[PDB]
Amino acid sequence: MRVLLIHADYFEYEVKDKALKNPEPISEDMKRGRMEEVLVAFISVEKVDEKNPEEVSLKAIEEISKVAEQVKAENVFVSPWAHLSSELAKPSVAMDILNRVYQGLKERGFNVGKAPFGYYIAVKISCKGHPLAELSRTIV
Amino acid sequence: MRVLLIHADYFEYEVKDKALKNPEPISEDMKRGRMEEVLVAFISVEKVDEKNPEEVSLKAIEEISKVAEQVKAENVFVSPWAHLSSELAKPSVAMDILNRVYQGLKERGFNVGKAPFGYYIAVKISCKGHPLAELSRTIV
To answer: Which family does the UniProt entry place this protein in (chains A, B)?
Structure first.
């Protein structure tokens, strides 16, 4: 798995078209969301992660947790993202791991948001620009 | 080299602290910039690119050009970015290639912006969310 972390003043999104033929169902509420003072985790779930979804999930949970604690973010947002890897896991594996990472951050005590899987999404983000505000991690 | 391309309604930035001890000099004007309807190229120049800066530059010029033409962007912004690679080129190599990619997009006919090298930068971006609006390319 590859992860890009962005410590943002705000992060806002609007679901546009479906990217999968059968995406994650969503309510009309879940078409748009916004959080402030948020660590945004853009996550590319990879083929190799099929091998051990829970180990990879636990690791991702922890690495994101550390950065949130370090930059003093209480808010965390989990986003699926294709763009840190050309070796992507099947959608079941991707949704599995995404949901585990989300549940684990909730259990850590963060106020966690997530994006629906299988859509094109419009995104507005304001990235802070202090030294720890954009970080990448590789998790295998 | 790895490149992330984002077709944006707008892209705005403010230079914050220096990341290098001796960054690219800038005027007080160049501390902030904004473009609209813009393809933003986040570029991670890599160690392997030292081997042949011009080939890699020409390739990057072309791949960014194709996407701009395809999404109908007249505006292109070139940004250095550490986050698509854990094998980064020295600053001379990085600045070299960045400047070549910038000059080549100018010669193609685009209205091109660039970000100063060696700083932490605060960024606001609105990503479109249509199918071609976020793309990655690997160039070696």
So the answer is: Belongs to the class-II aminoacyl-tRNA synthetase family.
